[PDB]
């Protein structure tokens, strides 16, 4: 409690300046547009940003951040930024002069894992709901995440889940509430 904690670095990119924070969650983007929309890194120019999996928040809540925003919000786990950068550099140096095949394998694997990670934000199954309900009549939902074991299930705001997973919600009640 009392400050957020970096749990894992999921990705890295150069995007528009200021396209970080809450407005970068997949649901914020789906509901209000990607603040990094139409960013042709080609004439802009951007800044180094990192996609963060936060401690205690499901992958649906991942946000893009910079070394600066991280520091600004006094997040814990900053040491992980240093390791990530060093590992990243090591990886670059070791792939410096690498056969086309080596580059081939690398790009392939990175896509496999990139896709895998995207599934972590998709509800595979609703498992239960809350007795309490929001003022708007939404109960929270216990979600099973695609690609992750049941130990990663988490309760999620009903309104949020309904905006994209109304099907899972419907099927949940259909198998008899």
């Amino acid at each position: 409690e009392e400050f957020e904690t970096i749990e894992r670095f999921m990705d890295c990119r150069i995007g528009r300046k200021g396209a970080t924070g809450a407005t970068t969650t997949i649901y914020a983007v789906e509901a209000d547009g990607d603040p990094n929309a139409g960013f042709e890194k080609n004439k802009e120019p951007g800044e180094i940003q990192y996609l963060i999996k936060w401690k205690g928040w499901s992958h649906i809540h991942n946000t893009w951040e910079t070394e600066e925003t991280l520091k600004q919000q006094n997040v814990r786990g900053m040491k992980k930024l240093d390791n990530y950068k060093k590992k990243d550099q090591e990886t670059k140096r070791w792939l410096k002069n690498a056969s086309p095949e080596d580059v081939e394998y690398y790009n392939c694997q990175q896509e496999l894992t990139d896709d895998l990670h995207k599934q972590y934000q998709i509800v595979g199954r609703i498992i239960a709901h809350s007795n309490q309900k929001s003022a708007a009549g939404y109960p929270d939902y216990y979600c099973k995440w695609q690609g992750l074991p049941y130990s990663e299930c988490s309760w999620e705001d009903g309104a949020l889940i309904s905006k994209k997973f109304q099907a899972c919600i419907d099927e949940y009640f259909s198998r008899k509430k």
């Binding site: 809450a22 914020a28 929270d140 705001d157």
Partner: peptide
């Protein structure tokens, strides 16, 4: 439940 408001 909490969201990135």
């Amino acid at each position: 439940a909490r969201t990135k408001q």
